[PDB]
């Protein structure tokens, strides 16, 4: 009915290995070379990536910053207001980053801030200055 379990035999393959008097051992060698070529190319990127892991040797412990969390307060201090304005200038709409920069304001508070002070901190002007980069 169909080729024995695990025996492989496509129409195509047969025509191809029969085609000539030694298109048999052509095709078998063509793949032996094809194989070594790929084993050599492996030996290479094994050797390339080998070097690049030596350059990451040390991880990034020397550059890690300890963990500070203070409570997320409610009141806007003048100090905090300014940090914000500058953050906006540097970050645009990235409420997430801006919240982190200030420290003690949640990403909603930051979002509200935008719309309340919007008038008085000319945030329109500021945000298009960010886009000019």
């Amino acid at each position: 009915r169909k080729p024995p379990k695990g025996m492989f035999l496509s129409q195509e393959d047969v025509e191809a290995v029969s085609a000539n008097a030694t298109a048999a051992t052509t095709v078998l060698r063509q793949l032996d070379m094809e194989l070594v070529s790929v084993k050599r190319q492996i030996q290479n990127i094994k050797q390339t990536n080998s070097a690049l892991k030596e350059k990451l040797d040390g991880g990034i412990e020397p550059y890690r910053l300890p963990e500070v969390i203070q409570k997320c307060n409610a009141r806007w201090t003048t100090e905090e207001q300014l940090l914000a304005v500058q953050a906006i200038r540097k970050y645009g709409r990235d409420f997430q980053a801006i919240s982190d920069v200030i420290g003690n304001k949640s990403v909603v508070q930051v979002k509200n801030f935008f719309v309340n002070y919007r008038r008085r901190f000319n945030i329109d002007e500021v945000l298009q200055e960010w886009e000019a980069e």
Partner: protein
């Protein structure tokens, strides 16, 4: 099967239906009502059963009708017709039976039979039991032909046929009942013994053995798919051989072995690329971080109190640094699981090879064994047809003749006009009759001549093939016949008989293989046989090898043997042999080979051509179409049972019927 039906099966006929043969002689019935046919069949079947239940004695018409019940015993022309038909086509009263009604006082018609093979001897008995005058002409000094049996003291061994290939449907079943035919079973277990450049040969372990055998079978099955489904049967105008197809199937397997390996290593690299282009981002982040840490560090050492821009600078840089220490951890995680996934891939390779050398040499034994059974290199077997007789195989385990097969042709030759040492040289057939010119094998000048109504030729296919001819036909045989001989294949295989004084092998083991080095000589002494209490080991030569071993002396051949047996059983434990015998079938001029095979470019249809008899031209032109004068039986004439003893036997029975029908008319369409 069980009942009358079991007789039918045992006689190679369908209990439940009428054959084309029967339709030929009983057209009234088979064109008729369903009812009547089923009567007929019972009658037929029952009559057989009777013959079978006791085949040491003739079955007469009366004895038959006696044993019938109504409504079957009621119509007695039908019962008589049936009985006669069976009788005629050796379905009943064949072989060796005690006659009830002693022979016709005088004999009608004269037949010359060429060759006292089994095919011959059988027909002869039939013809004579039908009361024709029959004379056989054998060139040998002995009956059987390719049923040879070596004898010396109590040391008995078959050089010719030896195996009954199952009693289930075999007419030899009937014969084995009519003769002692001492029938041993064959214990199928065969252990293999691979050489070692001279190092002691190690048996093959059951793991290997079993695996390789299965690949072999799988490979065959493969060639069959290849033939039927893919229809791969011609190649550069020439018909594809089995060997040819096997190579192709093997290559395609080795190819697939590679293609797996390739796409596996390519899966490896396509990961390495990901790992590489990750490691780059990871180096390029670590660099941006080093810098950014410094930058933050510097901005953090601006001592307070500070104005708000320089405060923001710290907070800003602080955030931007925890942003990158974020990302480097995602990448560092990814790195971890790609490297895991990499050892996964390099842990699970696909297969190294399709078959090793040590494997491919064992497989070459399974091939030699096939080249043995078929008596020919697989390069010669027709892919499309080599296995055509496979649906007609009998049932039951295969057996051996313990007392030597020659017992049979001998028994058949009792009461027959056999002229031994009589080599036929020319066959002449004409509308008026046939004359056969023979010689005496010893002084060839001493010539003989026999006139007869009809000639039956059981000459072996190898003989019919000889060029220039060993036997001349006058007139020549037609295109269609000669072409058919040309096309068919006649193989070869030989046996070496080793007689000893003491039983140095394993007594409980029947047969055991040997695995030489190269494909090239896979057939050479590839298998050994034990049987009787007699210290006889038999060694077999097959395939391309057997043809070449005929050009090598008995002593060298017996050497190559012992060498093999020593390397298995130990150089001290292997005596020189008392009596040695080697067959040389392809060189034996009364066979010119072992037996037929379906050559590439032949088909089963040739076997039918071979059986077709010859009718001469009319003597006086425009005179009436003559009788068919020259007939053919033999192993090569029986499409469905070729190259066997039973095949020949049947072909014999068959011609006898055809001849009798021709020369003594049919009393059973009356």
């Amino acid at each position: 099967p069980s009942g009358v039906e079991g007789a039918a099966f045992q006689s190679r006929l369908p209990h439940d239906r009428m054959t084309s043969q029967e339709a030929a002689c009983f057209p009234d019935i088979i064109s008729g009502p369903q009812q009547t046919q089923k009567v007929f069949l019972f009658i037929r079947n029952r009559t057989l059963q009777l013959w079978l239940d006791n085949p040491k004695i003739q079955l007469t018409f009366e004895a038959t009708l006696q044993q019938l019940e109504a409504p079957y015993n009621s119509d007695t022309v039908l019962v008589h017709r049936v009985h006669s038909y069976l009788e005629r086509h050796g379905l009943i009263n064949f072989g060796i039976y005690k006659r009830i009604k002693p022979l016709p006082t005088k004999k009608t018609g004269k037949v010359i039979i060429i060759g006292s093979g089994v095919s011959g001897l059988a027909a002869a008995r039939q013809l004579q039991s039908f009361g024709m005058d029959v004379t056989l002409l054998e060139a040998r000094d002995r009956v059987g032909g390719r049923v040879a049996t070596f004898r010396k003291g109590n040391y008995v061994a078959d050089l010719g046929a030896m195996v009954v290939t199952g009693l289930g449907g075999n007419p030899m079943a009937v014969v084995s009942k009519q003769v002692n035919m001492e029938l041993a079973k064959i214990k199928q277990k065969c252990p293999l013994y691979e050489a070692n450049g001279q190092a002691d040969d190690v048996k093959v372990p059951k793991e290997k053995d079993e695996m390789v055998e299965q690949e072999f079978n799988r490979l065959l099955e493969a060639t069959s798919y290849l033939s039927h489904q893919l229809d791969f049967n011609v190649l550069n105008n020439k018909p594809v051989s089995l060997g040819q197809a096997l190579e192709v199937v093997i290559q395609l397997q080795e190819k697939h072995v590679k293609d797996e390996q390739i796409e596996h290593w390519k899966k490896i690299v396509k990961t390495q690329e990901e790992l590489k282009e990750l490691l780059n981002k990871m180096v390029n982040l670590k660099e941006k971080i080093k810098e950014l840490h410094q930058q933050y560090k510097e901005a953090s050492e601006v001592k307070p109190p500070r104005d708000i821009t320089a405060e923001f600078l710290v907070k800003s840089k602080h955030r931007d640094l925890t942003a990158l220490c974020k990302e480097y951890d995602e990448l560092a995680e990814t790195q971890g699981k790609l490297e895991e996934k990499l050892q996964e891939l390099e842990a699970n390779p696909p297969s190294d090879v399709y078959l090793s050398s040590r494997d491919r040499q064992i497989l070459d034994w399974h091939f030699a064994n096939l080249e043995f059974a078929n008596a020919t290199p697989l390069s010669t077997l027709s892919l499309k047809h080599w296995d055509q007789d496979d649906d007609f195989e009998f049932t039951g385990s295969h057996l051996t003749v313990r007392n030597g097969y020659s017992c049979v042709p001998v028994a058949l030759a009792e009461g027959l006009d056999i002229k031994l040492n009589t080599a036929v040289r020319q066959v002449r057939y004409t509308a008026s009759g046939c004359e056969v010119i023979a010689v005496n094998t010893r002084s060839t000048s001493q010539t003989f001549i026999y006139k007869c109504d009809a000639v039956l030729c059981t000459l072996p296919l190898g003989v019919l093939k000889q060029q220039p001819p060993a036997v001349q036909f006058v007139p020549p045989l037609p295109e269609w016949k000669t072409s058919a001989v040309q096309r068919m294949g006649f193989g070869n295989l030989n046996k070496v008989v080793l007689c000893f004084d003491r039983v140095f092998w394993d007594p409980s083991v029947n047969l055991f293989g040997h695995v030489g080095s190269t494909t090239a000589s896979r057939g050479e002494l590839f298998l050994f046989w034990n049987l009787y209490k007699a210290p006889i080991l038999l060694a077999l030569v097959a395939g391309e090898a057997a043809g070449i071993m005929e050009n090598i002396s008995d002593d060298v051949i017996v050497g190559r043997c012992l060498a093999i047996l020593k390397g298995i059983f130990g150089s001290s434990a292997v005596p020189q042999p008392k009596e040695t015998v080697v067959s040389r079938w392809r060189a034996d001029p009364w066979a010119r080979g072992s037996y037929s095979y379906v050559a590439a470019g032949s088909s089963g249809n040739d076997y039918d051509l071979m059986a077709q008899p010859i009718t001469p031209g009319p003597s006086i032109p425009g005179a009436p179409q003559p009788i068919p004068r020259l007939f053919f039986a033999g192993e090569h004439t029986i499409r469905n049972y070729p190259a066997t003893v039973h095949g020949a036997l049947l072909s014999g029975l068959r011609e006898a019927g055809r001849i009798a029908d021709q020369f003594l008319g049919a009393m059973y369409t009356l």
